[PDB]
RNA sequence: CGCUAUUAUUGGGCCUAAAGCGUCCGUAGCCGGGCCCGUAAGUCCCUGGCGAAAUCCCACGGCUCAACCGUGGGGCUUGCUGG
RNA sequence: UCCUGGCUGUAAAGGAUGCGGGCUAGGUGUCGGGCGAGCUUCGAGCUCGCCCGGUGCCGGAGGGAAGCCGUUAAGCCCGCCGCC
């Protein structure tokens, strides 16, 4: 087969000209005082894995399904973005 | 708030539906609901109280 | 027993149908004739006659609306219209009555009271787009679609159809405490029907 | 303010629009699912303003389109707008015009006549909260060739639909869902009024009192 | 030929929903018909189903109440493990907790809440909502 | 590769747009009415032995963080086999 | 071009619509069989109605890009073959 080369940490726009987009990620970008798009990309992914991981965990049956919600609320908890007696909705 | 129901059908009344409500003419004392369907299709009905049963 | 005897019934001819017949009229045929004629019968007249009374009674007369395009049923609407306060248009029912509010003669009732569902289709349609409830005299040829209250009868003749609508407004009066109590009616039948 | 300024210079034609001046029928809900017949705006303005702000007066096509008398041919402008509250009310209309002024007027005034109301929930298998975001279930709708099917959405996904559909989802206050298509999109009427009918079949689905708490399901306005 | 009498039985009782009917007959009638009748009738989709002998081969008369909307056989009969019940679920159903997967088990008919609930599986043959 | 439900099990079409053999008989194969008894091959549950490591997901720890590396928990190997 | 006995295997060989089964309003004609009522010039005759099976016209719900189809589906379900 083949071996794996690593791969970039973020996501690329579907349609790179829509005017809506455009607007509010200059306004973000102008007030945050950040250098390329790259960077709000790679914030935007960190988020969308979040979400991912959630919907994929919730409603689900098994051990590691519960030890991994516990995992994915403390990590969000000790980075700051949620407080203790937070659920995953 | 509340959404009516057909009398002869079970079924829910929708917003802009050519449906019906009129009193039983042989008690007075109930509300006869018709739907579109049941009209155009000519499903029979009947009171609940009394039992006139009609068209 | 009857509102009116059973003598006056078949006299009238309340009781004659069509060559034709339906489904939906399964109910109210007795016999079909040995020339292939249908008969109905006079009880379930009878009974849906008082029924009708009954609720046109609990309504506002200046809120009904009665129609006959047919020519031998013009006469008795315009008279059972004179007596209960009801609306009435004989002829034509020009189209946009219910449903154009730039027209000169523009209503919109409560109930409506039709001679015959496929001669009057144009009021029945805008009945249905205007919600309300119908009453028809329905005969075996007819379908019973988008009617609410059928009255089975004959809907083609003078005699009947002035027999029927006497009768219909008499119970209207009853119900609405007018007359004490029938015979107290002094309107002859005669000036219901059509002249020659 | 308006309320009052709108109401003393409008003289109604209707039994509904007199109901409505002089203060029966006080609430949007109560003109629906009775078989009124609706032929004034001015009922739909005074009940629910919001549908004169311009932030609510998507206007969605305009075409040209040609007649032959040739003679010379003569061009008229046709106009599809959509007009809404974005809690539970949306309308469409489509207007004939000379002029695209004309044109416009008329096709708002046939979307505030045509005006509809709607449920909204939470029936996804990936949120489950009982909060009114989405759609409460699958539908489906048609219009010519196109065949539409939406489906309830998690909260965070926003409206995954052509553009026109998420102009009349927004307006009728949506904010997550899934979709499928069949047939020719780009007729933008036909379009259209598929999403407006599969957003209208939600009040045709059968239920029962615990999908209610279940779905949190809402008729119109919410809370 | 007949070949199922269950797929014929729940699309007689989808149209006849459909035009809006009150009682409906099931002429070649089954077992395994009355214990999907059994299964609607618990959860409520239904009414008042009961047999009738011919000499032949018995029929349902069954009593309906609006609250069908779809109703359907499950051809070929799947067969589905206790933990792969949700593609299904999307794949048959429109929402999350509504309309039933009537499930053949080795312990009966059932629901695949109630199966889950007993951790088993089996194979697939209806479904309702 | 996706766009493409322009290969369609999920999930397409065949009167007039591409498309029902000129009509019939029948071989293999595929699909097959209702009840009772048995069997347990398919099917379902539970447990033992296998499916190398790397590569995939999660958390913690060590390089200024990170990429990378380590310690653990799962998954992958389309499945095989004893009860 | 007809007759006797053989070959060829083709057509707008068209309902331009493969075959079987179940379900989803009917009206009005006509052919064959049966039953029931009346008439009868007593006729294997005439008239009306109902059941089964064939063959047509119209049509509400519904379907379809529309023309149009609509219990003799071009609707919903269960199968098999052929073709794009
Ligand atoms: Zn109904
Ligand atoms: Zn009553
Ligand atoms: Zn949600």
């Excluded at chain 1, 994915?72 to 949620?82: A, H, I, K, T």
């Excluded at chain 2, 959404?3 to 019906?20: D, F, L, N, Q, Y």
């Excluded at chain 5, 395994?32 to 029929?59: C, H, K, S, T, W």
């Amino acid at each position: 087969g083949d071996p794996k080369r690593q791969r970039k940490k973020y996501e690329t726009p579907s349609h790179p000209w829509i005017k809506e987009r455009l607007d509010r990620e200059r306004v973000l970008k102008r007030n945050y005082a950040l250098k390329n798009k790259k960077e709000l990309w790679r914030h935007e992914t960190q988020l969308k894995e979040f979400r991912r991981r959630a919907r994929r965990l919730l409603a689900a049956r098994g051990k590691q399904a519960e030890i991994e919600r516990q995992q994915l609320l403390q990590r969000l908890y000790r980075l700051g973005l949620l407080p203790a007696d937070a659920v995953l909705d | 708030f509340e959404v009516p129901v057909c009398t002869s059908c079970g079924k829910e009344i929708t917003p802009r539906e050519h449906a019906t409500h009129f009193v039983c003419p042989n008690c007075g004392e109930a509300i006869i609901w018709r739907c579109e369907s049941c009209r155009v299709l000519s499903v029979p009905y009947k009171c609940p109280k009394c039992g006139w049963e009609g068209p | 027993e009857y509102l009116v005897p059973l003598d006056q019934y078949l006299a009238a001819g309340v009781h004659i149908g069509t060559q034709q017949k339906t489904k939906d009229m399964k109910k109210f045929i007795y016999r079909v004739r040995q020339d292939g004629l249908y008969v109905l019968d006079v009880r379930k007249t009878d009974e849906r006659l008082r029924v009708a009374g009954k609720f046109l009674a609990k309504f506002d007369p200046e809120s009904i609306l009665a129609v006959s395009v047919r020519l031998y049923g013009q006469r008795p609407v315009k008279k059972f219209g004179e007596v209960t306060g009801a609306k009435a248009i004989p002829g034509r029912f020009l189209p946009g009555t219910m449903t154009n509010p730039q027209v000169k003669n523009f209503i919109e009732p409560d109930v409506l009271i039709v001679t015959d569902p496929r001669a009057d289709h144009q009021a029945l349609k805008e009945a249905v787009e205007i919600g309300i409830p119908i009453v028809a005299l329905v005969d075996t040829e007819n379908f019973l679609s988008y009617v609410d209250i059928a009255i089975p009868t004959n809907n083609k003749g003078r005699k009947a159809l002035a027999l029927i609508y006497w009768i219909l407004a008499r119970e209207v009066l009853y119900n609405r405490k007018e007359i004490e109590s029938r015979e107290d009616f002094k309107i002859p039948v005669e000036d219901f029907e059509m002249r020659i | 303010e308006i309320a009052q300024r709108v109401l003393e210079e409008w003289e109604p034609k209707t039994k509904l629009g007199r109901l409505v001046k002089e203060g029966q029928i006080t609430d949007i809900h109560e003109i629906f699912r009775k078989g009124y017949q609706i032929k004034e705006p001015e009922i739909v303005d005074v009940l629910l303003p919001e549908v004169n702000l311009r932030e609510n007066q998507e206007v969605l096509d305009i075409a040209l389109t040609v007649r032959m008398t040739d003679s010379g041919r003569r061009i008229r402008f046709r106009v599809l707008a959509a007009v809404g509250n974005r809690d539970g009310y949306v309308g469409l209309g489509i207007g004939h015009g000379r002029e695209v002024g004309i044109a416009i007027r008329k096709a708002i005034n046939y979307a505030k006549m045509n005006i509809i109301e709607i449920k909204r929930g939470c029936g996804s298998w990936e949120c489950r909260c009982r909060r009114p975001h989405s759609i409460p279930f699958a539908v489906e709708g048609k219009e010519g060739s196109v065949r539409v099917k939406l489906m309830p959405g998690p909260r965070g996904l926003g409206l995954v639909i052509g553009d026109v559909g998420k102009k009349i989802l927004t307006l009728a206050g949506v904010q997550d869902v899934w979709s499928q298509t069949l047939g020719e999109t780009r007729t933008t009427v036909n379009f259209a009024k598929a999403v407006f009918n599969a957003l209208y079949n939600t009040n045709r689905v059968a239920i029962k009192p615990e999908d209610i708490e279940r779905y949190g399901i809402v008729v119109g306005r919410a809370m | 030929t007949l070949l199922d009498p269950l797929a014929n039985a729940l699309s007689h009782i989808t149209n006849s929903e459909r035009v809006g009917k009150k009682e409906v007959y099931i002429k070649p009638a089954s077992k395994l018909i009355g214990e999907v009748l059994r299964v609607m009738l618990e959860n409520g989709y239904i009414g008042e189903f009961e047999l009738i002998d011919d000499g032949r081969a018995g029929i349902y008369r069954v009593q309906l109440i609006g609250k069908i909307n779809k109703a359907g056989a499950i051809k070929p009969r799947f067969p589905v493990k206790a933990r792969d019940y949700e593609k299904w679920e999307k794949r048959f159903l429109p929402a999350f907790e509504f309309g039933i997967l009537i499930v053949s088990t080795s312990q009966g008919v059932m629901t695949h809440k109630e199966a889950l609930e007993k951790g088993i599986g089996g194979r697939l043959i209806a479904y309702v909502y």
